[PDB]
Amino acid sequence: SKQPTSAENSVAKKEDKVPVKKQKTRTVFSSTQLCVLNDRFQRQKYLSLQQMQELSNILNLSYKQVKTWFQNQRMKSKRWQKNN
Structure with missing residues:
Protein backbone atom coordinates (compact mmCIF):
# COMPACT_ATOMS: atom_id res chain seq x y z
CA SER A 1 0.00 0.00 0.00
CA LYS A 2 0.99 3.65 0.27
CA GLN A 3 1.40 4.90 3.83
CA PRO A 4 1.34 8.72 3.45
CA THR A 5 2.75 9.57 6.88
CA SER A 6 4.63 12.36 5.15
CA ALA A 7 5.22 13.93 1.71
CA GLU A 8 1.95 15.66 0.88
CA ASN A 9 0.92 18.19 -1.74
CA SER A 10 1.27 21.34 0.33
CA VAL A 11 -1.77 23.49 -0.46
CA ALA A 12 -3.47 21.89 -3.46
CA LYS A 13 -6.77 23.74 -3.51
CA LYS A 14 -10.06 24.05 -1.66
CA THR A 25 -22.04 22.99 13.50
CA ARG A 26 -20.44 22.13 16.87
CA THR A 27 -18.15 19.58 15.25
CA VAL A 28 -16.14 20.78 12.26
CA PHE A 29 -13.43 19.63 9.88
CA SER A 30 -10.46 21.82 9.01
CA SER A 31 -9.39 22.71 5.50
CA THR A 32 -6.07 21.08 6.37
CA GLN A 33 -7.67 17.64 6.67
CA LEU A 34 -10.03 18.34 3.77
CA CYS A 35 -7.09 19.21 1.50
CA VAL A 36 -5.20 16.04 2.44
CA LEU A 37 -8.30 13.90 1.98
CA ASN A 38 -9.09 15.41 -1.43
CA ASP A 39 -5.46 15.22 -2.54
CA TRP A 69 -16.58 8.93 7.48
CA PHE A 70 -15.29 7.07 4.43
CA GLN A 71 -18.18 4.59 4.31
CA ASN A 72 -20.73 7.39 4.71
CA GLN A 73 -19.28 9.35 1.80
CA ARG A 74 -19.08 6.03 -0.01
CA MET A 75 -22.67 4.89 0.59
CA LYS A 76 -24.20 8.32 -0.10
CA SER A 77 -24.00 7.60 -3.83
CA LYS A 78 -26.23 4.54 -3.47
CA ARG A 79 -28.58 5.60 -0.69
CA TRP A 80 -27.99 9.05 0.81
CA GLN A 81 -25.70 10.80 3.29
CA LYS A 82 -26.80 10.66 6.93
CA ASN A 83 -25.60 12.72 9.89
CA ASN A 84 -27.18 10.45 12.50
Whole structure:
Protein backbone atom coordinates (compact mmCIF):
# COMPACT_ATOMS: atom_id res chain seq x y z
CA SER A 1 0.00 0.00 0.00
CA LYS A 2 0.99 3.65 0.27
CA GLN A 3 1.40 4.90 3.83
CA PRO A 4 1.34 8.72 3.45
CA THR A 5 2.75 9.57 6.88
CA SER A 6 4.63 12.36 5.15
CA ALA A 7 5.22 13.93 1.71
CA GLU A 8 1.95 15.66 0.88
CA ASN A 9 0.92 18.19 -1.74
CA SER A 10 1.27 21.34 0.33
CA VAL A 11 -1.77 23.49 -0.46
CA ALA A 12 -3.47 21.89 -3.46
CA LYS A 13 -6.77 23.74 -3.51
CA LYS A 14 -10.06 24.05 -1.66
CA GLU A 15 -13.51 23.18 -2.94
CA ASP A 16 -15.01 25.49 -0.33
CA LYS A 17 -14.03 29.15 -0.10
CA VAL A 18 -16.71 30.20 2.39
CA PRO A 19 -14.90 31.91 5.33
CA VAL A 20 -17.01 30.89 8.35
CA LYS A 21 -20.69 31.44 7.58
CA LYS A 22 -23.99 29.89 8.76
CA GLN A 23 -22.43 29.64 12.25
CA LYS A 24 -20.71 26.55 13.64
CA THR A 25 -22.04 22.99 13.50
CA ARG A 26 -20.44 22.13 16.87
CA THR A 27 -18.15 19.58 15.25
CA VAL A 28 -16.14 20.78 12.26
CA PHE A 29 -13.43 19.63 9.88
CA SER A 30 -10.46 21.82 9.01
CA SER A 31 -9.39 22.71 5.50
CA THR A 32 -6.07 21.08 6.37
CA GLN A 33 -7.67 17.64 6.67
CA LEU A 34 -10.03 18.34 3.77
CA CYS A 35 -7.09 19.21 1.50
CA VAL A 36 -5.20 16.04 2.44
CA LEU A 37 -8.30 13.90 1.98
CA ASN A 38 -9.09 15.41 -1.43
CA ASP A 39 -5.46 15.22 -2.54
CA ARG A 40 -5.09 11.59 -1.51
CA PHE A 41 -8.39 10.69 -3.15
CA GLN A 42 -7.10 12.28 -6.36
CA ARG A 43 -3.56 10.85 -6.20
CA GLN A 44 -4.64 7.38 -5.10
CA LYS A 45 -7.80 5.42 -5.86
CA TYR A 46 -9.32 5.51 -2.37
CA LEU A 47 -8.53 4.66 1.24
CA SER A 48 -7.68 1.02 1.74
CA LEU A 49 -8.32 -0.97 4.89
CA GLN A 50 -4.85 -0.14 6.17
CA GLN A 51 -4.78 3.44 4.87
CA MET A 52 -7.74 4.40 7.08
CA GLN A 53 -5.79 3.32 10.19
CA GLU A 54 -2.71 5.24 8.99
CA LEU A 55 -4.83 8.33 8.39
CA SER A 56 -6.44 7.88 11.79
CA ASN A 57 -3.03 7.92 13.48
CA ILE A 58 -1.93 10.99 11.53
CA LEU A 59 -4.97 13.15 12.27
CA ASN A 60 -5.08 11.92 15.88
CA LEU A 61 -8.55 10.53 15.18
CA SER A 62 -10.14 7.14 15.73
CA TYR A 63 -10.11 4.23 13.28
CA LYS A 64 -13.83 3.96 14.01
CA GLN A 65 -14.28 7.58 12.99
CA VAL A 66 -12.08 7.44 9.89
CA LYS A 67 -13.79 4.28 8.62
CA THR A 68 -17.28 5.63 9.24
CA TRP A 69 -16.58 8.93 7.48
CA PHE A 70 -15.29 7.07 4.43
CA GLN A 71 -18.18 4.59 4.31
CA ASN A 72 -20.73 7.39 4.71
CA GLN A 73 -19.28 9.35 1.80
CA ARG A 74 -19.08 6.03 -0.01
CA MET A 75 -22.67 4.89 0.59
CA LYS A 76 -24.20 8.32 -0.10
CA SER A 77 -24.00 7.60 -3.83
CA LYS A 78 -26.23 4.54 -3.47
CA ARG A 79 -28.58 5.60 -0.69
CA TRP A 80 -27.99 9.05 0.81
CA GLN A 81 -25.70 10.80 3.29
CA LYS A 82 -26.80 10.66 6.93
CA ASN A 83 -25.60 12.72 9.89
CA ASN A 84 -27.18 10.45 12.50
